[model samples]
Target: VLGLAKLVGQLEDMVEESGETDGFDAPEWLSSWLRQPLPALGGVNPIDLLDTMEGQAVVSRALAQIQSGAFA
Candidate 1:
């Protein structure tokens, strides 16, 4: 996990330093909120984004249905 954190930080720094300011603007409140320790969006671990039981159950059932050909 520590290694992953370091790798992600390095990648973020590289992207920021690349000077490709295409879509990096954040709203005032969002930017301020991100300064604190919060769960990152679309991190290396997808499961880390699921912090609620309802979300977990919905994702689990949706994945099961998708794999079972119910949506096909």
Candidate 2:
């Protein structure tokens, strides 16, 4: 399970490599949303991106399964 900082670092690298012209190919709305700069902080926070309830639930469930010897 990658931490939020690592995840964000990876995303930043990808965005830098992709450049402003050749953008990522995700959902249209998501791509658009990612393109916007955070007005308050002037930069996006990766933890915020992964801080959703749904993401938390998914991570918890995956961790539980992993701990239960399900994959080991």
Candidate 3:
């Protein structure tokens, strides 16, 4: 298993970077999203990247891409 603290920190960083300050259920929503397949990720589930910082960054970037409507 990966480090929970690091994972938690990354999740928080994602929210901050995405300007989701009032996202109380954000963490919950993100956790749910981890299992979903995304077009931004070539149909890959975000949970697959939870094992490493580099991979998590990819997930964060994917979110940003989605936010910007750059990806389907």
Against the hidden true structure, what lDDT does model 2 obtain? 0.43
lDDT of 3 by residue, 35-69 (tens): 88876778888888768789877876776664465
Candidate 3 stretches greater than 4 Å from native: 1-24
Ranking the candidates on lDDT from highest down gives 3, 2, 1
Clashes of each: 0, 0, 0
Q: Encode model 1's per-residue lDDT on 1-72: one tens digit a residue.
A: 223343334334544665454575423323343234333232223344246565444434433443345651
TM-scores, all models, native as reference = 0.29, 0.27, 0.57
TM-score: which is higher, 1 or 3? 3
Off by over 4 Å in 1: 1-49
Best by TM-score: 3
Q: Rank the candidates by TM-score, best first.
A: 3, 1, 2
lDDT for 42 (candidate 2): 43
User: Which residue pairs collide in model 2, if any?
Assistant: none
Question: Against the true structure, candidate 1 has what lDDT?
Answer: 0.39
Report the poorest 10 consecutive residues by lDDT, candidate 2: 58-67
Candidate 2 segments exceeding 4 Å error: 1-49
The 10 consecutive residues of candidate 1 with the worst lDDT sum are 37-46
Put down candidate 2 lDDT per residue, 1-72, tens digits, no spaces.
325444344445545555442655434423444446434324653234445766544433432443244651
